[PDB]
């Protein structure tokens, strides 16, 4: 089946720029795979931030952008804040049927 | 804003059915689809189903293309989950999912979860 | 037998209004239901904000406000503040006993 | 406030009966009424009973019915459950609920939860 | 055998008076069960504060103090702060060996 | 402070005998007492055990009475208890507890537990 | 940083075979050293094994040296670990862990930890 | 088997000095073991301090240093901040594996 991967955490400071990146085991992360990142904190509560690789939810800042990096999706996060630690989950779109990493878990210190 | 509108939490045994609901708050059923993700603790979230209100597109996979089963409904606008044969592996939280994907703007805004427990 | 359903999550903003709603799988929610509305908070504390579809708990403030509306009941917070953030649970009288709904978490940011 | 007081824990074992307590520091008895509510985690809380102190009128369900009893005491005044025939599916905390519901204004206060462990 | 019991939950504000029973199933706690009070506080740090009914722990302020009452011990606390918010325990001595109540939860709001 | 203290943790597996340690940071072993209190999750905190260094006094109880012994030690200075035939059921935090009840002022300090696991 | 880098999670079955990895972003494979320590919860940490790229040297013990088994690759760079006839027991959350120990300064960056689920 | 032995909790102020051990089960730990020093904090997060005994992660501060005592290996922190409450596991090299003491739990209060 499709595995999506990951990175399990990432630690950043304020002010400062992070990447997460979301691989496909069946070959190049794809625009056909609208790639899709949600935030999650605290107490099982998730928010979608972009869907179809680039596309922000009304009201995510622009400091949040995806895009396709090689064969991976991307997501980076401009001059972090302390609010802006999460667990990070990416979703892959296979032809009628998403599947999920395992989220990466950002740190931001402090 | 938009949001997604499901059900706190839903009791049932082994053997049973359940249903649970995916409601839109301010959209159009006709354009846009839906998702339903199951998170189990340490599990993460594993991808269910999906759906399409007029002829139809529900699409599961091989060990859902069993008991678990999606749907719509119109007047009111809603969206189905069915869970036949209830296990008592079939407690989670059952994540939907909701807007857009037609080719405007915006963003799907993830329902609450509905906590299944099986049983007591 | 009788299943309370409300909803599983809302997401507000400070000095907005919220609202819960409550329904009855017997029918409507009726002031024979006498709608109970108690706040959750960590560490499993429980707090009966109001009783008998809108009457107030000594020094619950008048923002919170119970109704009902429809066929289901109401519980209306106006104003939120960040202490608002809390798990609201409704409760329904049929005849002699209770029946919970699974409550509403709300959240606050921030 | 006014305030409800039941005790912090109690363990059994399968097979023993127990009792639990609910106080009401402050009020009238003899007007009100009481409840019994079942929290296990991921159950939610699940609605036990009843109870009232002069002829009687203590109301389960047909699950409750046997096992699990609710009662009063009238010179210190204090609400009662017992579950005969403890479980290992009896573990929880049970919460008791307090006051008004005869027309005065308002609201119940609810008791801290008793943890019932069975066993070790 | 012994059962010691405590109520299960106190709410509080900060400048206000608490106080904490804790009975003997075996008859009155009296001054040869040394009424012990332990706060724990999360992630399983417990504290003794006071030991044999009324003797503090060194730099337990003076605003903690236990004694009997009636057939029973208490732990009063003068002043509560938002730093008193912890699981307050009871243990007493039966000629060799404590015996725990299931610890009072103190709520300060806030 | 003064300050008891003991091991982080240890892993046992079941039937073997396994050792947990009470130390003193600053004290007088000659004039005090110390228990054992298991703590599992949703058992509470459960009294164990006691010891005396000199001649003796180590006092359990009628389930404790068999695997479960406390003991000291001189040169060093240090409080046990065993755990002979471990059992899966044995798996938690045992808390050690120090100073005084001589006819002096102060309290104990408690440690900070072991975590037993048992097996992996 | 320098930092390490594994995968979120993975999701087997009983009797399968997986493989978990552990890339370094910005060092020298040719130097340095890896290691594999398992997280179960009340198990704490426990170490598993190790490994060099060249000739060879992946270290474990006489319960890991069966399934587990650990590896290197060049060209992209990174470290593995195997665990064949995977088992319910195999749960947990394995970190992998980085660099120096050649003679230089610094030090290893824990990974973040990868979650293995088995089975649903 | 080898064991290490670190205590399960202390408690500290800001601006006070506290010391961590670690003993090793086969005799004293030497500088062939490679004490190492892990600070964990709230989700799972494990961060290297020290390696090799006294050797610091580039950036952590002067205040955190690595020793041998006797025949042990100490982790001292020097003007302990409200920050460096975590949990410190100890690591010692037997050869070609890691062995993990329990964790240190470090109370800052606060
Ligand atoms: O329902 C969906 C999606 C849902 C989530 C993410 C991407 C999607 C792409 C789609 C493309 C075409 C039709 C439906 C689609
Ligand atoms: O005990 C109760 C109640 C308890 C909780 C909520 C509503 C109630 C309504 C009541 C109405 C009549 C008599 C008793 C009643
Ligand atoms: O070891 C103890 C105690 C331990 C905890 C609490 C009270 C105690 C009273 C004691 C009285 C006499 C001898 C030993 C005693
Ligand atoms: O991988 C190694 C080593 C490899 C060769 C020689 C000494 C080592 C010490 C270590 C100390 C801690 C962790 C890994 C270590």
């Known amino acids: 089946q499709a595995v999506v991967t990951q990175e399990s955490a990432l630690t950043t400071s304020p002010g400062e720029t992070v990447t997460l990146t979301c691989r496909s085991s069946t070959g190049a992360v794809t625009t056909s795979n609208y790639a899709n990142w949600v935030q999650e904190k605290p107490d099982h509560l998730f928010t979608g931030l972009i869907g179809g690789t680039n596309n922000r939810a009304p009201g995510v800042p622009a400091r949040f952008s995806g895009s396709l990096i090689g064969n991976k999706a991307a997501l980076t996060i401009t001059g972090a804040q302390t609010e802006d630690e999460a667990i990070?989950?990416?979703?892959?779109?296979?032809?009628?049927?998403?599947?999920?990493?395992?989220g990466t878990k950002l740190t931001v210190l402090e | 804003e938009v949001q997604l509108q499901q059900s706190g939490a839903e009791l049932v045994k082994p053997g049973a059915s359940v249903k649970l609901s995916c409601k839109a708050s301010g959209y159009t059923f006709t354009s846009y689809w839906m998702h339903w993700v199951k998170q189990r603790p340490g599990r993460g979230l594993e991808w269910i189903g999906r759906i399409d209100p007029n002829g139809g597109g529900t699409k599961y996979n091989e060990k859902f293309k069993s008991k678990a089963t999606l749907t719509v409904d119109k007047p009111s606008s809603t969206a189905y989950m069915q869970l036949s044969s209830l296990t008592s592996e079939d407690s989670a939280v059952?994540?939907?999912?909701?807007?857009?994907?037609?080719?405007?703007?915006?963003?799907?805004?993830?329902?609450?979860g509905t906590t299944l427990t099986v049983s007591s | 037998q009788a299943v309370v359903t409300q909803e599983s999550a809302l997401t507000t903003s400070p000095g907005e209004t919220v609202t819960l709603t409550c329904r009855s799988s017997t029918g409507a929610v009726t002031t024979s239901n006498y709608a109970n509305w108690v706040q959750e908070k960590p560490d499993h504390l429980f707090t009966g904000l109001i009783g008998g579809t809108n009457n107030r708990a000594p020094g619950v403030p008048a923002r919170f406000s119970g109704s009902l509306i429809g066929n289901k009941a109401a519980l209306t917070i106006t104003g939120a503040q960040t202490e608002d953030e809390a798990i609201?649970?409704?409760?329904?009288?049929?005849?002699?006993?209770?029946?919970?709904?699974?409550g509403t978490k709300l959240t606050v940011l921030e | 406030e006014v305030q409800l007081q039941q005790s912090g824990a109690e363990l059994v074992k399968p097979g023993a009966s127990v009792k639990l307590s609910c106080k009401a520091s402050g009020y009238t008895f003899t007007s009100y009424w009481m409840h019994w509510v079942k929290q296990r985690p991921g159950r939610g809380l699940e609605w036990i009973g009843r109870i009232d102190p002069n002829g009687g009128g203590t109301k389960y369900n047909e699950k409750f019915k046997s096992k699990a009893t609710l009662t009063v005491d009238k010179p210190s005044s204090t609400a009662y459950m017992q579950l005969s025939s403890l479980t290992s599916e009896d573990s929880a905390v049970?919460?008791?609920?307090?006051?008004?519901?005869?027309?005065?204004?308002?609201?119940?206060?609810?008791?801290?939860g008793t943890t019932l462990t069975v066993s070790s | 055998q012994a059962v010691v019991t405590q109520e299960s939950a106190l709410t509080t504000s900060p400048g206000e008076t608490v106080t904490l029973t804790c009975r003997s199933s075996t008859g009155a706690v009296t001054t040869s069960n040394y009424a012990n009070w332990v706060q724990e506080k999360p992630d399983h740090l417990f504290t003794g504060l006071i030991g044999g009914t009324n003797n503090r722990a060194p730099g337990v302020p003076a605003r903690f103090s236990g004694s009997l009452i009636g057939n029973k011990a208490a732990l009063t606390i003068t002043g509560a702060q938002t730093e008193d918010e912890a699981i307050?325990?009871?243990?007493?001595?039966?000629?060799?060996?404590?015996?725990?109540?299931?610890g009072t939860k103190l709520t300060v709001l806030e | 402070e003064v300050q008891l203290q003991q091991s982080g943790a240890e892993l046992v597996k079941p039937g073997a005998s396994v050792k947990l340690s009470c130390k003193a940071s600053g004290y007088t072993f000659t004039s005090y007492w110390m228990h054992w209190v298991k703590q599992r999750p949703g058992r509470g905190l459960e009294w164990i055990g006691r010891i005396d260094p000199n001649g003796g006094g180590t006092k359990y109880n009628e389930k404790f009475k068999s695997k479960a012994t406390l003991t000291v030690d001189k040169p060093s200075s240090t409080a046990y208890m065993q755990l002979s035939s471990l059992t899966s059921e044995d798996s938690a935090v045992?808390?050690?507890?120090?100073?005084?009840?001589?006819?002096?002022?102060?309290?104990?300090?408690?440690?900070?537990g072991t975590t037993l696991t048992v097996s992996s | 940083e320098v930092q390490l880098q594994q995968s979120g999670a993975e999701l087997v079955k009983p009797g399968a075979s997986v493989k978990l990895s552990c890339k370094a972003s910005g060092y020298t494979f040719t130097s340095y050293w890896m290691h594999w320590v398992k997280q179960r919860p009340g198990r704490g940490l426990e170490w598993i094994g190790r490994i060099d790229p060249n000739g060879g040297g992946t270290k474990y013990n006489e319960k890991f040296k069966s399934k587990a088994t650990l590896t290197v690759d060049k060209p992209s760079s990174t470290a593995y670990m195997q665990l064949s006839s995977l088992t319910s027991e195999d749960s947990a959350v394995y970190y992998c862990?980085?660099?120096?120990?050649?003679?230089?300064?610094?030090?290893?960056?824990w990974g973040q930890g990868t979650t293995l689920t088995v089975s649903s | 088997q080898a064991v290490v032995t670190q205590e399960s909790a202390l408690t500290t102020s800001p601006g006070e000095t506290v010391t961590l051990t670690c003993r090793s089960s086969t005799g004293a730990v030497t500088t062939s073991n490679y004490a190492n020093w892990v600070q964990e904090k709230p989700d799972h997060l494990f961060t290297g301090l020290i390696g090799g005994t006294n050797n610091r992660a580039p950036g952590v501060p002067a205040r955190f240093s690595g020793s041998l005592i006797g025949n042990k290996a100490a982790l001292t922190i020097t003007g302990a901040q409200t920050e460096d409450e975590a949990i410190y596991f100890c690591?010692?090299?037997?050869?070609?594996?890691?062995?993990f003491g329990g964790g240190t739990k470090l109370t800052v209060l606060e």
């Open positions: 862990a980085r660099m120096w120990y050649y003679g230089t300064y610094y030090f290893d960056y």
């Open positions: 690591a010692l090299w037997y050869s070609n594996h890691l062995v």
